[PDB]
Structure 1
Amino acid sequence: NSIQIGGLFPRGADQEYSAFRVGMVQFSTSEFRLTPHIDNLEVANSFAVTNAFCSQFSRGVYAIFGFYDKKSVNTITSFCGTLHVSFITPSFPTDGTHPFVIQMRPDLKGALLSLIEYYQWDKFAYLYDSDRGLSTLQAVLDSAAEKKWQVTAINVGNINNDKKDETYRSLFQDLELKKERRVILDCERDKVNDIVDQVITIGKHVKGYHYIIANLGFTDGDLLKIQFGGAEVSGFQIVDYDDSLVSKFIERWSTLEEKEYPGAHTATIKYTSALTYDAVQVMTEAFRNLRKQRIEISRRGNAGDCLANPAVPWGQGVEIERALKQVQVEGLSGNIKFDQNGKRINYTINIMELKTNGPRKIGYWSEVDKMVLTEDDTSGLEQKTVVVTTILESPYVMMKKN
């Protein structure tokens, strides 16, 4: 009845673990129950990740739910490729087809390339952060030569937080040389809130500018500060709060005590934590399908030292890969399904424009259909003051005597 799994959590991801504990209770049946082993470590230090993964492998788990950084993603993906241990993650998907990885985050590359094509952009800025892989930067660069775009890629990531005022004032001085008015922000929801505040300081948020936040949590970050400036701000949202499923989850979420569940007493949940809750439903239903299929998975004995040479892989990991990769359930992230590589498939990403009345569901795409939502007859603002410019030169435009 006790199924052992390993959890690799960043030390600063309290809500991302708060959602994990909630999932354990919601899907806990009388047939069995999952037993987690939680190791809070530094996600970037791959030596800690290696020391953590091998801690769970010696304890003999059956799958591992964790995260990874750019500096550590390969460490996870290669140990799981040899030892045939299954890894479920809500971080960015692996740049390539790696087995035994259950990527809970959908591929956003298809979204950004077409959102650009909807607005008919042919010259824009791209402030990226390598903390989540250069997968998307190679996408906009590859499609830049095909469609003959004129793009400026700026590795805004490696910047120090003490000289941040003088360097951020310096970045926008470069972008002024082409009078760039179309910017894509590709940082994590943290550094975006840093760029947002420095955009308000220099005042580049009025009529004319048009930003696109490129992560799955448009409503996660704060938008009320660049809402009324007049700059159109687009984004992406994966946790559709309109679905009665999430509203069922949000109602129970809004009430939990914040001491036992940090960062959970609010009405929203970050796309990272939301994918974590939806990860438990994948694993619980994965093993339940092993039971009904009459499949025996318990380890024959000690898995031994992960550094065992030659590396002998326990055979039943393949059945766990095929079990997790054939799960199909419904959760906060809408539809959930995986291909033979573990990548998100058959999914749905919501598109959001920021207006005067707040975030507004405008569009959505799919790995088969792109930009379909037409339209939003509901909501609506019906408020548009058209800006008209003219020159003081008699007798066309003269200031009255009074």
Structure 2
Amino acid sequence: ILRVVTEYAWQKFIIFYDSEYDIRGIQEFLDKVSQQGMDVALQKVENNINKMITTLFDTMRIEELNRYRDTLRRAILVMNPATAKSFITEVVETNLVAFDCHWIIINEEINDVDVQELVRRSIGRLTIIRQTFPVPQNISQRCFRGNHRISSTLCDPKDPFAQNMEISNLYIYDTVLLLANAFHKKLEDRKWHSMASLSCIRKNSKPWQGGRSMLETIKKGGVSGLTGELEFGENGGNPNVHFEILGTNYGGVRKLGCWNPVTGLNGS
């Protein structure tokens, strides 16, 4: 979000977040914008937008709303798409934004149906930032990885399930996939160590003697799945991630660029 904001040369904008978001996620962002001397407002968006905005007009006086309108010309939404949809509509309909506004929505999880609906509801420039998964061309090969066949319900992107999957769902698939390959290699190499029946609340209880070798095998595993490549670095965490950046100035959405943490930003 910092990189994108920097590219647009924003100096003044408002960050909107939903009622479940943990703002520690942007503590580093807030530090940096302050360090660069920007004017950044924060507001939590209640889950019922209708009473929020109605309350606003009543509560706030004219000169405040004029200040508020100006502030909304540049905004970042850090919220789930459902709340964002409702929020965008209500501000638009109540004339709190206009054609010159530019809003950014950022969330790993925004599906194609959500993106289309957000664009439909917005009336200025909109930028959408979401995580994307490297998936093959030729729709037929989308449902295979080598000889491994994936249920069409997960890989057919015309499928309602597929279009409604949570990101965690994709990772769950690849996790099962990764484990299977880990077990396979361990079995094939004839270096199997059996599972053990363990006991928890027993300060005497011992750990699984097989755990260290299994962990090492899984940790050094890698598979191609629905998320792209799943694998682990030396620190035990998946390093692979990709973000796409979508846009539309109104008057329809297109790809502006891509981001990943090694190469950085590509495109405008």
Partner of 2:176: 280
Partner of 2:20: 131
Which string of whole-angstrom CA distances, capped at 9 and with x for unpartnered residues, describes residues 170-223 of structure 1?
A: 568667525111111112233223323323332445412212111123435253
SS at match of 1:353: strand
Shift in Å, 1:318: 3.3
Q: 1:340 is matched with which residue: 217, 231, 234?
A: 234
Partner of 2:194: 298
Unpaired segments of 5 or more residues in structure 1? 1-111, 375-402
Q: Give TM-score, length-normalised by structure 1.
A: 0.53
CA contact (8 A) 2:101 2:124 kept: yes
Partner of 2:146: none
% identical aligned pairs: 22
Q: 2:79 is matched with which residue: 173, 181, 187?
A: 187
Which string of whole-angstrom CA distances, capped at 9 and with x for unpartnered residues, describes residues 315-353 of structure 1?
A: 433334333332322333333332233333143222211
Partner AA of 2:22 in structure 1:
G
CA contact (8 A) 2:115 2:128 kept: no
Q: Give TM-score, length-normalised by structure 2.
A: 0.75
CA contact (8 A) 1:347 1:366 kept: yes
Partner of 2:99: 207
Distance 2:204 2:66 in 1: 58
Partner AA of 2:86 in structure 1:
D
Q: Give the aligned length.
A: 252
Partner of 2:9: 120
| Bigger helix share | 2
Shift in Å, 1:363: 0.7
Distance 2:65 2:237 in 1: 36
Distance 1:225 1:148 in 2: 31
SS at match of 2:33: helix
Partner of 2:216: 322
Partner of 2:50: 165
Distance 1:129 1:357 in 2: 29
CA contact (8 A) 1:227 1:356 kept: no
With over 3 angstroms needed to count, the CA separation of the structure-2 counterparts of 1:177 and 1:367, relative to structure 1, is: same
Larger RCO, structures 1/2 (Cα 8 Å, 6+ apart): 1
Distance 1:319 1:232 in 2: 53
Q: CA RMSD in A?
A: 3.6
Shift in Å, 1:278: 3.0
With over 3 angstroms needed to count, the CA separation of the structure-2 counterparts of 1:244 and 1:310, relative to structure 1, is: farther
CA contact (8 A) 1:227 1:358 kept: no
1:149 lines up with 2:44 in the alignment: no
- Mapping for residues 314-393 of structure 1, pairs under 5 Å: 314-354=208-248, 356=250, 358-373=252-267
Partner AA of 1:284 in structure 2:
A
